[PDB]
Every structure is written in C-alpha cells, then in structure tokens.
C-alpha cells in the first residue's frame, strides 16, 4: 500500500537508498550474470578476479573496455532520475538522501545524484597496480592499443595487447599498470566506505532497496542494521513475494519508483 509508504516519505529526514543491478539493467546495461549474460566464451565470474587479471590482463581490459564503451549509448532511466531529483528537492528542505549502490556504471552520477557511495567501485576509475592511486577516467578509448577492441562476439579474435601498452599510470616516476577500480570476486570491500555507510544507516529513518532484495548480498549487510532500529524498508524490484506475506512494490523501478518519490 503506497499511500502508507508516502506517509513515511513525507516525514523522513535521513533517507538511504540502496541500489542493485536491476536499475542498471533497466537502462540496458549488461550485467553478465545468470544464464544469457556472456561476453565471448565467458561470464563475469571468469574475468572479474585478480587471478584472471594476473593471468591475462589484455583479455580482462578488453572486457572492461567493452563495458566502458557500451555506456556511451545507455542512459539513466526514470528511477535514476527520480532518485536524483528527490535528493536535490529534499536537500533544499534540509532533509537528506544517500545512495549506496553496488553498480559500477556511474548512472547515478549521470542522473545528477551526488551523495552516492559506490561500494563495488567504478568502470570509470582506475587504480595503479604499482602506486595504488585512484583516478577518474572516461578517456574513450582508455588507451590507443584498445581502440575498437573488446568486441563481444564469441569467436572474435583476442587483441593480445602487450602489457606495456595497456593503460598505465600517468605519474612518469611510476608508469604502473592500471586496473579498473572495481571490486572483483574474492576481494574485500573498502573498509572506510563501509564505516561511512554504517554511519549513514544509523541516521537513516527510511530505507529503500531498488533493483535487488534485502535477502541477498549486499542489501543483507545493511537492511538488518536499519530494521533492528524499527525503521521502515521499501523494496522496489521485479521479484514476487508469496500471496500470504516491509513494503514491496513489484514491477520495474522505472515505473514503480517515480510515483513513490514525487
């Protein structure tokens, strides 16, 4: 029941919004998850690891180059926008809105969201393998050797770029090898980010979960911290809930969310 949700929304002064893959999916971003999402022969799991990067950095950068480049045509959807406009509108009223996203595509920044926490990092940030420096980067192509590479067809031929010519650190002292500043399978989340999110979820008096459920990583790390404090939690996703069974608004975030946040 929407009008009950809206009563909380009306009151709420510190709102946290946790966004999952569903919302990036609705803008047509590939997530490479479940059966169907392949890039060439492989799935996310195969390439998104420190093992794969150490063993074939040209292949992984090809994959990450592709994903960077498909974003030139995928745009924020109404869910992205309603969240950004909400943030802005409530900001002026001295209320507040934080976004905690597992997504790496910067669509929240591109819709105009500002207080965003990217817990899995970003396709358009690099980290130096040598000096560890994090730097924004939308350079297209990220480097010449990758130009028009990363093509997604199963029997595309590998680029096999020499590692010296892969993207490198700009401080010439260093010239270190860059990697996408994205959290890979079997790496740890940044501890400072988690400390901030903890802090934000403590202030929080209404919490939205969008394009994912409370039950699963990563929403499951946080939704308990808020729920235990008796704070309402609204899921907006495409997953059903059984006939018999805090708020859940079924259907697409693009359709469900803007009416809720107006």
């Amino acid at each position: 029941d929407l009008t009950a949700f809206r009563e909380h929304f009306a009151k709420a002064k510190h709102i946290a919004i946790i966004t999952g893959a569903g919302v990036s999916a609705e803008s047509g971003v590939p997530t490479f998850r479940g059966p169907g999402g392949f890039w060439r022969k492989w799935q996310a799991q195969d390439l998104a690891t420190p093992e794969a990067f150490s063993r074939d950095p040209s292949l992984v950068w090809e994959f990450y180059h592709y994903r960077r480049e498909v974003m030139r045509s995928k745009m924020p959807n109404p869910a992205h926008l309603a969240i950004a406009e909400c943030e802005a509108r409530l900001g002026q009223q001295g209320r507040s809105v934080v976004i905690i996203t597992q997504n790496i595509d910067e669509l929240h920044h591109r819709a105009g969201s500002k207080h965003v926490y990217e817990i899995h990092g970003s396709l358009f940030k690099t980290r130096c393998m040598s000096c560890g420096e994090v730097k924004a980067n939308h350079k297209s192509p990220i480097c010449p050797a990758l130009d028009g590479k990363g093509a997604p067809d199963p029997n595309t031929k590998e680029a096999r770029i020499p590692v010296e010519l892969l993207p490198r650190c700009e401080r010439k002292s260093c010239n270190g090898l860059l990697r996408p500043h994205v959290v890979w399978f079997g790496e740890t989340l940044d501890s400072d980010i988690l400390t901030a999110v903890e802090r934000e979820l403590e202030k929080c008096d209404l919490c939205l979960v969008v394009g994912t459920s409370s039950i699963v990583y990563p929403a499951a790390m946080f939704a308990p911290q808020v729920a235990s404090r008796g704070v309402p939690v609204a899921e907006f996703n495409m997953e059903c809930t059984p006939a018999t069974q805090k708020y859940h608004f079924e259907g697409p975030c693009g359709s469900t969310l803007p009416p809720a946040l107006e």
């Binding site: 899995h120 959290v183 890979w184 079997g186 790496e187 740890t188 989340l189 988690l194 990583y217």
Partner: peptide, 8 residues
C-alpha cells in the same frame, strides 16, 4: 574485510 558476495 568483507569479502564480495560473502565469498559466494
């Protein structure tokens, strides 16, 4: 530190 996906 928190393993990503809880280490699936």
């Amino acid at each position: 530190x928190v393993l990503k996906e809880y280490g699936v």
